[PDB]
Amino acid sequence: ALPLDTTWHRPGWTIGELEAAKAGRTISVVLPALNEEATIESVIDSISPLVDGLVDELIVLDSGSTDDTEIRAIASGARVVSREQALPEVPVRPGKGEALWRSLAATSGDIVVFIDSDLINPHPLFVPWLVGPLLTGEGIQLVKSFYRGGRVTELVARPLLAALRPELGCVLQPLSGEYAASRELLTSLPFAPGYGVEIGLLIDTFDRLGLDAIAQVNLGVRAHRNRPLDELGAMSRQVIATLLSRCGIPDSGVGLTQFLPDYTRHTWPVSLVDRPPMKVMR
């Protein structure tokens, strides 16, 4: 009933059916992590039993953690890849977008799956539920999750999409950190910086491929780190810079400033520079 292929109830496929449907295609899972020692182990544990089966490869993309994220991830049996190790020839920029872009060179799966590592008790069927439409359907090359926080999504992204890309008004969680896509697509797209990356991939895929190439799946309920408003303001600023750039609208490039007392002025970084398609780095 939506213009977007949408699985509403717990998808029917089993691990075995999906594993059969792979048909030579490989699957890589990437957990980007910046200081998530408190949750990373449960997130890895919820996925590592699929390894050597449905999943051929699982990595943690360590985006410069200074806490005990790496040693706990290792202790959970996960391969940990720094931004440096993933693509040593290129100096590292900050932001999640960078990490996701770099994870493309540290993985070799025909299908790449992303899962945020700050999720509190993720369901072990997240990955299957996410690769469902890619494996069985035809035409699908991007799968976003949806779920029943949510402030930047409900106040910035979905209303802006309503404003500038109404065709995507039916995407329920455009910023979801849990999503999957073909390597062919991901290596063809540029990667927006910082927190601009999701909204960047959505608009670019659609612009390049239309809604038929996009699916979304219900994963139930999502719980994650509740961040302070100033950080969300910064994130919201970058989401806006990337969305505006994809719509052909010039963004000033000026970072958001916040005040909190004569007074204490702080400016957050914002970037208008995308990383190119990983294809060009062959």
Alpha-carbon span 217 to 47, nearest angstrom: 18
The letter for the amino acid at 196 is: G
22 is in an annotated binding site: no
36 is in an annotated binding site: yes
Report the residue number, 96 or 237, with the smaller CB distance to ligand UPG: 96
Q: Should residue 264 be labelled a site residue for a second copy when binding is judged by CB under 8 A?
A: no
58-82: b (≥16 Cβ within 10 Å) or e:
bbbbbbebeeebbebbeebebebbb
Alpha-carbon span 213 to 199, nearest angstrom: 16
Residue 262 binding target from Mn ion, a second copy, ligand UPG, none, CB below 5 to 8 Å by type: a second copy
Alpha-carbon span 227 to 17, nearest angstrom: 39
Alpha-carbon span 247 to 156, nearest angstrom: 15
Binding mask 3-42 for a second copy (x = CB under 8 A): -----x----------------------------------
- Sign for the CA dihedral angle at 210, 100, 122, 235 comes to negative
Residue 166 binding target from Mn ion, ligand UPG, a second copy, none, CB below 5 to 8 Å by type: a second copy
> Which range in 5-13, 18-26, 114-122, 263-271 contacts ligand UPG by CB under 6 A?
114-122
**Min dist. Cβ of residue 266 to ligand UPG (A):** 18
Q: Pick the binder of ligand UPG from 22, 224, 251, 281 (CB under 6 A).
A: 224
**Min dist. Cβ of residue 43 to ligand UPG (A):** 8
63 is in an annotated binding site: yes
25 is in an annotated binding site: no
Report which DSSP code applies to 258: E
**The two structure tokens encoding residue 189:** 């797209």
Report the residue number, 68 or 207, with the smaller CB distance to a second copy: 207
Residue 150 binding target from Mn ion, ligand UPG, a second copy, none, CB below 5 to 8 Å by type: a second copy
Which parts of 201-260 interact with Mn ion (CB under 5 A)? 224-225
Q: Which residue's entry shows tokens 């100096």?
A: 91
Which pairing describes strands 27-33 and 79-82: parallel, antiparallel, or unpaired?
unpaired
Alpha-carbon span 20 to 86, nearest angstrom: 30
Residue number of the CB closest to Mn ion reads 224
* Discontinuities after residues in the chain (C–N over 2.5 A): 148, 261
| Paired residues of 60 in beta bridges | 31, 80
Report the residue number, 11 or 95, with the smaller CB distance to ligand UPG: 95
The total of other beta-carbon atoms located within 10 Å of residue 90's CB is 15
The letter for the amino acid at 58 is: L
Q: Pick the binder of ligand UPG from 11, 109, 133, 177 (CB under 6 A).
A: 177
Q: Should residue 227 be labelled a site residue for ligand UPG when binding is judged by CB under 6 A?
A: yes
> Which range in 85-93, 94-102, 103-111, 182-190 contacts ligand UPG by CB under 6 A?
94-102
Report which DSSP code applies to 154: I
Binding mask 207-236 for a second copy (x = CB under 8 A): ----------------------xx-xx--x
Given the rule CB under 6 A, which residues bind ligand UPG? Answer: 32-34, 36, 63, 94-96, 99, 116-118, 175, 177, 195, 198-199, 224-225, 227, 235
